[model samples]
Target: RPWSEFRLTPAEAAAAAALAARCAQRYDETDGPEFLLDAPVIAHELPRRLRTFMARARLDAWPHALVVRGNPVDDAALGSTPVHWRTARTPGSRPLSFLLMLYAGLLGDVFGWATQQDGRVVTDVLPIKGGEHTLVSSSSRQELGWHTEDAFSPYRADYVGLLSLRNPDGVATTLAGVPLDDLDERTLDVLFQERFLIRPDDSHLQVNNSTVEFEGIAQAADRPEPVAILTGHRAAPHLRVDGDFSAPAEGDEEAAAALGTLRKLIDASLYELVLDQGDVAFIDNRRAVHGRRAFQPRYDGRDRWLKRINITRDLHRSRKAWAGDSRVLGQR
Candidate 1:
């Protein structure tokens, strides 16, 4: 099923922006403890209707995702897309960063993988100059392959939030769900078993990581353990396979065939979405797989850019992986 879309009333947009502005004045860092503590308080100031939508969506996860549109974003005010993620949090993008965090707080506790983007709770998703052909969010020429975000980890996000700062070209994001009607009983049974292996994606590698913040991403890639691609209810299980990095467990031919069928089925079911400027989507990580289409890059101050964050319904579910008292998660 398609996601639920919400168009904010002009008045509501103004009020939301004003609240974020207030937050920007008080909070300088998105991953810091104080901001994490205060965001839910400020998020309570959002429209009651919006809060209800988020609460219901999380409770049921029926629509697979929630898309909120009509937040005001001026291209000029956002400034140029930064050349690298490390510098993307320029002052020009500060208010929107706060805005994204406030929206995320309404859904769940926001967190980040210690291995990804330097453990940044709020990370940037903009095309980088030297990364156009790689397998990551920054790649433009190469299509980003479909996967549950951080699929290799048990502590993966429940919701993947993307706040589009700008996407002048309207490049579409891709999505697909488990092909419930197309699968046979045997294939479904294999999928639900712990017969698949999903390695960490390249975005978690040391190249994309900082020495100080780097977790065991490289180690995880080296020693990827077995995991089930499907879990939850048998009639409507959740998905966790990676299009580019998933493989069957060694010596498991039946598992391999099931995975092959799964890949083809998901490919046929895949669909696209365009997140315009000021649009925000919280994709249900358990229910859907998402990626981006291949698009040519425009480096002249106008590449598609987004502010991204991860959220979970229960923060303590991954407490074993929590980096000390911080929200950053890592393998135990």
Candidate 2:
């Protein structure tokens, strides 16, 4: 099936560029690092041409990101462009000073707008569950469990784009698996055995999630295919990570344990990587388990702020999954 026809309108396109500019300007004011400077720098870099080149790789996406934190960078893309970034610290600091919302055009959604029709976008730093702090840090003592950001949606998300406008405390942003292929056989097996439940964050999905258990996947029953992740077909297994939304069925304890083990693998084998200005990470939301290191806070211009976007696969999937709304089980 062909991909869904997703594109940006003129106004949306213009807004995208504006958002990029905001990200850059914020970085400069915060004393963050700059690695390159060119007219229409946003037009050229990874934003425009990396996807075609990376398709053969079978992976979804990744950005040649340039990350900054509390101070400037000595070793960046161009090893520091003609400018520099400054900062103003705060107690509840966040990673990635800001983001270029427009860059999401390549993937779709105006400003990478979510499929959400409510018009209210999904913020990277969400405090929905009543109480969870949203501070920015890129080191230890601030570790997050291994899970994909929004795996509960009806369709499987291909990639996760995290464009950092600043780094965490002038140190590199520590991501678990730079790319997710660095896992062992034991870990891979644990990933493919379908067992856990899949449902939206909506109360409807929650209700559906609880009512259904391990079954052969029947509509109005064990819907949306509970245990089917995008495991590698002709090659290695890819992953679709998410925190525990549903547990295992009666005989599925071992299967559930396998999922747990994979998360452990991600937690134990975490390796760090840094992104710089003009450097956006196109994460394989399906094949990897990513988390950042801790960072010190300074709410100044250079405070960490990362933009998050949810890009769907294509037409066939979207048309099937979404009933003209962002509601549960394909809207009404």
Candidate 3:
């Protein structure tokens, strides 16, 4: 099945870029309270055609992701990919970061995890020097396994927005939707039952960050509740399984067999979507599992870099996990 895509004309793309630039000039930071509160309303000023596309495309049922292309990013202006995500908010990437937030506003309420990237709503995805083989997004040499973004959390994103700042190597991002066709009736029945567990990924670990140990993430990892991998409608169900972190319930052989079959089906159906510089994709978190292919990291200035954000249809849905009045989600 083909993913839905919209291409902005040169004039429209320029107009959108200028809008983000103006916001960048006015706001101190993309994740600041001022911008976070204003971005959705400000997003109304973006090209009408682009806004229309977002409104209509989100209603469709099948596409794994919504991709918008043709935004131009200058390599010389972008400078080099950061050595680590902590220092990734370089001057060059500021406007694009704002642009990503604006695009994200059109879809839903934007948020960040307290355990990820020091709780910044706008996060970076780049190959870190020492983390090449790790399971986190910063890993380069290891293929990032496919999983629902933050599958372990009940408050996980409804849509995950990614903007490619630079992709000199054209590394392909992998995606796979529900393998409904390949699953047998018995396996499907088992999958729908709450007989599996999904632990928080390593990205949320204290070791991945520079400062505080996140109690919310630690608790989630220590005591993950049993959950069903598939939910909602039967024909086109929602997905919630982490390939590297999910497992069947303790000693449940039937559930284990179902999970094993699911793993094979998902692996077989995996496909790639390459995001070159300036392209943006809003992956439907409930509909597809996504990852990145293993590739050698280029320690030089130019390398594959991306900006990421998380969105939910409603902010109050995760009130229990809210960290005070800020848009950031999860506990300390």
Candidate 4:
């Protein structure tokens, strides 16, 4: 019910793999993010296997229970994007990361889609490439910041899965969250305050307060601290606090300042670990916000790469609210 937690293990991973393949092994490939659907099958099954694993390194506990590691393969494939993968294409029918999406979308389903979509999920399995800063920059090292994924996708997903296939740069890629335990009640209060704005991650779209009431919370100030994510739960907060997408309430600099302060604090202690192969990271939409920073690229065989999956608990609930591609629904 709070923030979610993430951990890592071996036998558990193997079990996930075995179960995932049994759930939704493969399907017709889409342009870019189709595999996202493929992962739900495995995700649909994990909640039942919590006790099968021998040893699991517990990270946090609150809104979620996320696990990160270089196991099984450091990551799994849920699906791929039709964006063509920039420079590094895993293969025609072959993908580098698959199972993580299964975890991503399924996690949302497990939570009963507390999201507006109710019982559906949608994930963006991004495969960014990094090269000489040319046409490179796969879905991997994009100099991320405190921002949420698909922030502009109209009906944002309840959760997101970004697992590293490889991070050769030691360059650093992560889903950092502030353990609410680290914050005082005064600060936590700032987060739940309603009437905030969720700016479009893209530079083109903007939602001023007059147009709509924003219910998003963030701490992406220059400081990046005070971890705003309520980690008392297993899951970390899934937040996107770029000064670009988030704005404070109607007239509360204190809210802005507090968020700003929180942002700065998190920048320092956010599990700043470089995503090695086999590392899976998931963020709960209602629980937290997230983003990444920029990095150099070699474009060599060993570049920073992550397989992303945007899954939801239910897509039908948001049928009429869909904004990314379409929203019109059926007459069922």
Estimate, for each residue in 17-108, the C-alpha lDDT of model 2 and write its tens digit: 45544555544421222311221244344323233333333332333222212222212221211111111122122222233333333443
Q: What is the descending TM-score order?
A: 3, 1, 4, 2
Per-residue lDDT over 47-102 for candidate 3, one digit per residue giving the tens place of the 0 to 100 score: 99999999999999999999999999998898989999999999999999999999
Q: Is candidate 1 or 4 superior in TM-score? A: 1
Using TM-score, give the best candidate's number.
3
Model 2: lDDT of residue 166: 47
TM-score for each predicted model, relative to the true structure: 0.97, 0.53, 0.98, 0.58
Model 4 C-alpha lDDT per residue in residues 1-332, reported as the tens digit of each score: 23333444566667766665543345443223444434544455664555222113123334332545644553234222343343233442133343554555445432111222221222222333422222122334445565555443434555666667555455554454454556566766666554345543432212111111112212222222232323233333444354345666657686777677677676664555455666665665544556555665444444555655454557765665433442221111
**Each candidate: what lDDT?**
0.88, 0.39, 0.93, 0.45
Question: Which regions in candidate 4 have their CA more than 4 angstroms from the true location?
Answer: 1-26, 30-65, 68-89, 92-98, 109-142, 150-154, 178-191, 203-240, 249-252, 314-317, 323-332
- Candidate 1 lDDT score relative to the true structure: 0.88
Question: Clashes in candidate 2: how many?
Answer: 55
Flag clash pairs in model 1: none
Give per-residue CA lDDT, model 1, range 1-332, as digits (tens). Answer: 48888889999999999998888887768778999999988899998888887777677746778899999998778789898898888888999999999999998899987777878999999898888899889999999988999888888888999999999999999998888989999999999999888988888877886653344666667777888999999887998989999999999999999999999999999999899999999998999999999999999988999999999989999888877899988863
